[PDB]
Automatic annotation (TrEMBL), chain A:
Belongs to the complex I 20 kDa subunit family. The gene is NDUFS7. It comes from Sus scrofa. The chain holds residues 104 to 258 of 258 of the full protein. The lineage of its organism: Eukaryota, Metazoa, Chordata, Craniata, Vertebrata. Core subunit of respiratory chain NADH dehydrogenase (Complex I) which is composed of 45 different subunits. This is a component of the iron-sulfur (IP) fragment of the enzyme. This is NADH dehydrogenase [ubiquinone] iron-sulfur protein 7, mitochondrial. Residues 30-139 form the NADH:ubiquinone oxidoreductase-like 20kDa subunit domain.
TrEMBL record, chain B:
Its EC number is 7.1.1.2. GO terms for biological process: aerobic respiration; mitochondrial electron transport, NADH to ubiquinone; mitochondrial respiratory chain complex I assembly. It catalyses: a ubiquinone + NADH + 5 H(+)(in) = a ubiquinol + NAD(+) + 4 H(+)(out). Keywords: Electron transport, Membrane, Mitochondrion, NAD, Respiratory chain, Translocase, Transmembrane, Transmembrane helix, Transport, Ubiquinone. The lineage of its organism: Eukaryota, Metazoa, Chordata, Craniata, Vertebrata. It is a multi-pass membrane protein. It comes from the Eukaryota. This is NADH-ubiquinone oxidoreductase chain 1. The gene is MT-ND1. PROSITE patterns: COMPLEX1_ND1_1, COMPLEX1_ND1_2. It is found in: Membrane; Mitochondrion inner membrane. GO terms for cellular component: mitochondrial inner membrane; respiratory chain complex I. GO terms for molecular function: NADH dehydrogenase (ubiquinone) activity.
UniProtKB/TrEMBL annotation, chain D:
The gene is NDUFS2. Residues 87-298 form the NADH-quinone oxidoreductase subunit D domain. Its EC number is 7.1.1.2. This is NADH dehydrogenase [ubiquinone] iron-sulfur protein 2, mitochondrial. Its cofactor is [4Fe-4S] cluster. Signal peptide: none annotated. Core subunit of respiratory chain NADH dehydrogenase (Complex I) which is composed of 45 different subunits. Component of the iron-sulfur (IP) fragment of the enzyme. Interacts with NDUFAF3. Interacts with NDUFAF7. Interacts with CERS2. Belongs to the complex I 49 kDa subunit family. Keywords: 4Fe-4S, Iron, Iron-sulfur, Metal-binding, NAD, Translocase, Transport. It is an enzyme of class 7 (translocase). GO terms for cellular component: mitochondrial inner membrane; respiratory chain complex I. One of its GO terms (molecular function) is NADH dehydrogenase (ubiquinone) activity. It catalyses: a ubiquinone + NADH + 5 H(+)(in) = a ubiquinol + NAD(+) + 4 H(+)(out).
Automatic annotation (TrEMBL), chain E:
It is found in: Mitochondrion inner membrane. Residues 68-97, 107-136 form the 4Fe-4S ferredoxin-type domain. Its cofactor is [4Fe-4S] cluster. One of its GO terms (molecular function) is NADH dehydrogenase (ubiquinone) activity. The keyword Iron applies. It is a peripheral membrane protein. GO terms for biological process: mitochondrial electron transport, NADH to ubiquinone; mitochondrial respiratory chain complex I assembly. Core subunit of the mitochondrial membrane respiratory chain NADH dehydrogenase (Complex I) which catalyzes electron transfer from NADH through the respiratory chain, using ubiquinone as an electron acceptor. Essential for the catalytic activity and assembly of complex I. This is NADH dehydrogenase [ubiquinone] iron-sulfur protein 8, mitochondrial. The chain holds residues 64 to 239 of 239 of the full protein. [4Fe-4S] cluster 4 binds at C77, C80, C83, Y109, C126.
Length: 155, 318, 70, 298, 176, 55, 96
């Protein structure tokens, strides 16, 4: 029936979306150099099918990586805004997760989710490179469990 | 049956371009000791499909300050011209046996700059504007050497008929006669096609994404498809020009083997260069062309015009 | 190692393989086995138009010689 | 004409909260301050703090500090060169060296237990011992890294595109460089005859020989040669420290500033009190002030 | 001591300038780069196959926290309250209470993963090795709430990774 | 290591140096991850003879 | 395990098809690795539990679980203490 056909069509879109995302690491702090470390030949995101792409109008997932301050706050949001859909943000490190080591200082917003809708929270200070690689794997598993076409069918 | 042959030419190239993203991604990674796409299907074979249909399902956001008619015409010209680049190629027997194919080749290649200028203006952002202006500025500087190189190279061929290049190279590769021009032609092809060090047009690190700084999703692939299609065609054009192959009339299969095998070798050395050299700079980009390339091209052209006369080796015009 | 990229480029060789084979075989098939008789100059063109009119079937590629004259 | 480096897009409390954290609690800040040179920061903090306490670490502790300090120097100079090559174009030396960067990052993990923010260099020495055989693995790494440096120089040093984007670019005279408050390689590239490890040798740096790579032009290229030479001279320190690693304790033999050994914690009462007040109140540093200076790779 | 890095003496003999002209005309040094990267390609890669194989780690690794218990099974924690006093980010919150037996342990051991920074000071602080922090690093999540670990969450995780961390401190307590 | 002498020759000639002598990866030369228990030394002032903190 | 491969890929895994009543043939996660084997796989100890079984305890989780985020058996934080200020209980029946 139509449910089976739309299920296949959803999976066809699902498979590419979980295998062709191009992250844009908004390099902030010591969390950022770790993401460049999981760009090293040791882990090599690109073997999964993701490429470090600038010009965030091309990227799909964007990674906040480090502390986020009020000075960085409004610009960082705008990066999220003209970031085209589907758009997902992954919280890298404790500082981006919940302020972390600077949670009480006067200049850093406690947690990055206060600015953008965090999809995956990755703990770490810094999260070891493969721990983020795990988080990216979780992103594709979550991407696998969506019902975009299915919901529209019942809409 | 002329029609089915046309789709038999344009469809395989588009699929070839898609797979070019995968091989370049893997080969470039391998220089960097990485592995490149190997998770999405066997050895990443379905990565081009994954990238292609993910971007198609991404909304083509038009910038607020954009002329939509102007924003859309540029990819149409860019992609159509790139696919039109192959219609006079001497692939076994050339599709469009234009007696002036080389001029037709150059005119269409030079018309590609309108996509660069129009994309930058239609985007209407300072970053895109100066990105495009220098992009064409790099672009318009070099094809004068392209024309000079071809005029000197084709001088011993006999005419501008692309099919005639096969009979000229019937014995030895044409590179041996004009290897100073061969490297002259080769480097200028990178500048036209905008690969590193001549990537200041795009400049991923320092110009974000050049004219594609905003260009996203749907029609972004068109520049990407047109760009990578030109890579094969320019390398294919170099393959026939200098690295000619014997062509038995009773077996065009054999020369296709030689032509094809050469043109992947020429594309492979393209991204091989990318994975080794720093990116150039705008001033050196012009200075290298106008100070050390133009004078050498002039002299070599002067050498190659007089060479057939001093050796009584002028070629037949037919 | 580098034997993993050969699957990528082998498909590439197959992609560029197709246009050469098609235009070779369609030219062979349409023009009765022979290749497309090219006419870069008006002489070769009016050569063909003579062949098309002389074939008795209005196709140039149909070649028919000494069996005609008497 | 003019460029304004508008900074502050990362300004955290840092010093502001240090007024509220004890000396031990403040130590991890430096690991996160100049985050790419992990140990070299906390080297400065420990040297500063132990100076006020008038307590010198045991010689075994000093040798571990300098070995990791120069290993950290390898960490940062690889960062500085490869990241620069990223933006200049060629990006393969990036990945080539980053494969090595993991190896010393793995070494960080073997000793401290974390990848980047080791928090190893504590006032009074180091927190823990090197695991058995750790010197052997870094010895294997040390042998092969000289080749990896050759990859960089072969990749970049003679390449025209690299040079022309770098040579005679951003040159600064010695007087302005010194007046600008510059330091480290910034002065050395302009031919300035100065180096903290040599002129004011802190820790063991006096009992080791190395050649400071003084440039002679002051442009960007001179510093690039100076930095890659600093790599090789850093490799000299690893070898000298390797063959001359003395035995002995890891921290000072003063429980008032060094937490007692875990074994002594649970058998000796004085250790319990000393461990207790150290982890809740912390050692009291005598009043005063001190600007302690070390040559970070930056 | 010191050494110069760019004092160069280009010999002006007719021999040497030929190489310099050869270098500029024929891109010899550029070809050096091409053959350099080609040798790299002809080498193996070092990309570990995650998650089918993961990075090499060490027994001293600092990961996710997990409260443990004695061989008898009673919680090692006695609410000495050292760990939060040294906790550089104040991620440890705890309140002790009287217990029915009189072995009055804590009713609250809440460590905020998004505030904690994984220094490992808590382990060194704890006199009974109650709070250790395990080798796991896969404890990612999608909502900020599930990172606010509580007394129950640590106890469950301690009972989960008990097989691992027990050997880790077994092979590392001599160093500590 | 795995790699045959043929393309080992290709790496050696293209790089201008022998790479089999030392490689950027690791092999059996690495000390195994079950090192024996240590016997870390004692402090210089660990003596139970005259050791007064007044010194 | 294969000692001939370089450090890292020298020992590895392919995951099971059934994990705690969950289909995992296509999906792959690193967290189904049980703790005692998690020690050996990360090269934290080069001797597998098959030859050095972990010490048995009454409380050690008999069935290891993967990450439960995004699933109905997720973790949800909640205050573990007890409400301390209790209201004055309103009496009942009379008036004045
Ligand atoms: C009887 C004999 C008749 C003929 C004799 C001809 C003379 C002898 C032969 C001379 C050499 C050949 C002609 C000149 C070639 C060089 C032109 C030139 O300007 O060089 C200097 C130029 C400029 O060097 P420069 O900028 O350092 O110095 C130039 C001089 N000043 C400083 C005054 C400006 O070199 C380059 O442009 C470097 C290469 C740039 C492009 C980057 C990619 C290079 C990829 C190389 C590998 C791939 C090669 C593929 C070859 C083709 C394969 C099909
Ligand atoms: S979470 Fe830790 S490692 Fe990451 S930016 Fe904050 S302090 Fe640095
Ligand atoms: S490692 Fe322990 S002491 Fe340090 S911040 Fe985290 S919970 Fe607190
Ligand atoms: S976990 Fe240890 S340090 Fe923390 S309160 Fe309990 S006994 Fe004290």
């Amino acid at each position: 029936r139509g449910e089976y056909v739309v299920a296949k069509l959803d999976d066809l879109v699902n498979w590419a979306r979980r295998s062709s995302l191009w992250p844009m690491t908004f390099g902030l702090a010591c969390c950022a150099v770790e993401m460049m470390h999981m760009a090293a030949p040791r882990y090599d995101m690109d073997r999964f099918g993701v490429v470090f792409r600038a010009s965030p109008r091309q990227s799909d997932v964007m990674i906040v990586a480090g502390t986020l301050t009020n000075k960085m706050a409004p610009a960082l949001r705008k990066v999220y805004d003209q970031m085209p859909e589907p758009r997902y943000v992954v919280s890298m490190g404790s500082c981006a997760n919940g302020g972390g080591y600077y949670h009480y200082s006067y200049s850093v917003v406690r947690g990055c989710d206060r600015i953008v809708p965090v999809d995956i929270y990755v703990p770490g200070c810094p999260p070891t490179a493969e721990a983020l690689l795990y988080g990216i794997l979780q992103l594709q598993r979550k991407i696998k469990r969506e019902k975009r076409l299915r919901i529209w069918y019942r809409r | 049956m002329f029609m089915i042959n046309i789709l038999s030419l344009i469809i395989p190239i588009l699929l070839a371009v898609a797979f070019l993203t995968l091989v370049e991604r893997k080969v470039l990674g391998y220089m960097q000791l990485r592995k490149g796409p190997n998770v999405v299907g066997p050895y990443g074979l379905l990565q081009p499909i994954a990238d292609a249909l993910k971007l198609v399902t991404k909304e083509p956001l038009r910038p607020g300050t954009s002329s939509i008619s102007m924003f859309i015409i540029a990819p149409i010209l860019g992609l159509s011209l790139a696919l039109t680049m192959w219609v006079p190629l001497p692939m076994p027997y050339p599709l469009i046996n234009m007696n002036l194919g080389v001029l037709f080749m150059l005119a269409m290649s030079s018309l590609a700059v309108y996509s660069i200028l129009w994309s930058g203006w239609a985007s209407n952002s300072k970053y895109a504007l100066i990105g495009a202006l220098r992009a064409v500025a790099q672009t318009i500087s070099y094809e004068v050497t392209l024309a000079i190189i071809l005029l000197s190279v084709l001088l011993m061929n006999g005419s501008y008929t692309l099919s005639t290049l096969i009979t000229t190279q019937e014995h030895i590769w044409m590179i041996f006669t004009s290897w100073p021009l061969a490297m002259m032609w080769f480097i200028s092809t990178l500048a036209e096609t905008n690969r590193a060090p001549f990537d200041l047009t795009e400049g991923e690190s320092e110009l974000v994404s050049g004219f594609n700084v905003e260009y996203a999703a749907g029609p972004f692939a068109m520049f990407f498809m047109a760009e990578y299609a030109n890579i094969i065609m320019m390398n294919a054009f170099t393959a026939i020009l200098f690295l000619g192959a014997s062509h038995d009339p009773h077996t065009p299969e054999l020369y296709t083997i030689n032509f094809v095998l050469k043109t992947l070798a020429l594309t492979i050395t393209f991204l091989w260069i990318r994975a080794s050299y720093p990116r150039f700079r705008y001033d050196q980009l012009m200075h290298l062309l106008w100070k050390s390339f133009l004078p050498l091209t002039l002299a070599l052209c002067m050498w190659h015009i007089s060479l057939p006369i001093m050796t009584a080796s002028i070629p037949p015009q037919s | 190692m580098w034997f993993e990229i050969l699957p990528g480029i082998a498909v590439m060789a197959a992609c560029l393989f197709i246009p050469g084979m098609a235009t070779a075989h369609i030219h062979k098939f349409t023009n009765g086995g022979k290749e497309k008789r090219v006419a870069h100059f008006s002489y070769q063109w009016n050569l063909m138009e003579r062949d098309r009119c002389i074939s008795g079937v209005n196709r140039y590629h149909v070649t028919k010689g000494l069996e005609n004259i008497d | 004409r003019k460029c304004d480096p508008h900074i502050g897009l990362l300004h955290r409390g840092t010093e502001k909260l240090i007024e509220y954290k004890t000396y031990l609690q403040a130590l991890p800040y430096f690991d996160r301050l100049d985050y790419v040179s992990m140990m070299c920061n906390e080297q400065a903090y420990s040297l500063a703090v132990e100076k006020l306490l008038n307590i010198q670490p045991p010689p075994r502790a000093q040798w571990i500090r300098v070995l990791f300090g120069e290993i950290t120097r390898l960490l940062n100079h690889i960062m500085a060169v490869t990241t620069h090559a990223l933006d200049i174009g060629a990006m393969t030396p990036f990945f080539w060296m980053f494969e090595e960067r993991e190896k010393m990052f793995e070494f960080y993990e073997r000793v401290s237990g974390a990848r980047m923010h080791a928090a190893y260099i504590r006032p009074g020495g180091v927190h823990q011992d090197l695991p058995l055989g750790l010197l052997d693995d870094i010895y294997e790494f040390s042998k092969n890294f000289s080749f990896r440096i050759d990859e960089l120089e072969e990749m970049l040093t003679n390449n025209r595109i690299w040079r022309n984007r770098t040579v005679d670019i951003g040159v600064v005279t010695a007087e302005d460089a010194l007046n600008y408050g510059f330091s480290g390689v910034m002065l050395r590239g302009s031919g300035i005859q100065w180096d903290l490890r040599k002129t004011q040798p802190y820790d063991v740096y006096d009992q080791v020989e190395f050649d400071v790579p003084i440039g002679s032009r002051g442009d960007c290229y001179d510093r690039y040669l100076c930095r890659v030479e600093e790599m090789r001279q850093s490799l000299r320190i690893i070898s000298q420290c390797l063959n001359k690693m003395p035995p002995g304790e890891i921290k000072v033999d003063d429980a008032k500033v060094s937490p007692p050994k875990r074994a002594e914690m649970k058998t000796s009462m004085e250790s319990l009190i000393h461990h207790f007040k150290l982890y809740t109140e912390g050692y009291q540093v005598p009043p005063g002030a001190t600007y302690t200076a070390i040559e970070a790779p930056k | 001591t010191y050494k110069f890095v760019n004092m160069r003496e280009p010999s002006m003999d007719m021999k040497s300038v030929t190489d310099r002209a050869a270098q500029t005309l024929l891109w010899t040094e550029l070809v050096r780069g091409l053959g350099m990267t080609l040798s790299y390609l002809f080498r193996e890669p070092a990309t570990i196959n995650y998650p089918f194989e993961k990075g090499p780690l060490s027994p001293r690794f600092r990961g996710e926290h997990a409260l443990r218990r004695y061989p008898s099974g009673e919680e090692r924690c006695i609410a000495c309250k050292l760990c939060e006093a040294v906790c550089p980010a104040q991620a440890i919150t705890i309140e002790a209470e009287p217990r029915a037996d009189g072995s009055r342990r804590t009713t609250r051991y809440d460590i905020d993963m998004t505030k904690c920074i994984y220094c490992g000071f808590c382990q060194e602080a704890c006199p009974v090795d109650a709070i250790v922090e395990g080798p796991n690093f896969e404890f990612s999540t999608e909502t900020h709430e599930e990172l606010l670990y509580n007394k129950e969450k640590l106890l469950n995780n301690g009972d989960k990774w008990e097989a691992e961390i027990a050997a880790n401190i077994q092979a590392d307590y001599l160093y500590r | 290591a795995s790699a045959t002498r043929v393309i080992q020759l290709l790496r050696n000639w293209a790089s201008g140096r022998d790479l089999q002598a030392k490689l950027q990866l690791r092999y059996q030369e690495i000390s195994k991850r079950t090192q024996p228990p240590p016997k870390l030394p004692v402090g210089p002032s660990h003596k139970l003879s005259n050791n007064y903190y007044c010194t | 395990e294969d000692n001939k491969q370089f450090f890292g890929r020298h020992r590895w895994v392919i995951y099971t098809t059934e994990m705690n009543g969950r289909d995992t043939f296509w999906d792959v996660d690193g967290s189904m690795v049980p703790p005692e084997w998690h020690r050996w796989l990360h090269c934290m100890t080069d001797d597998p539990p098959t030859t050095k079984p972990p010490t048995a305890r009454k409380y050690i989780w008999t069935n290891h679980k993967f990450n439960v985020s995004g699933t109905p058996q997720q973790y949800v934080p909640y205050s573990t203490t007890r409400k301390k200020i209790q209201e004055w209980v309103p009496p009942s029946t009379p008036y004045k």
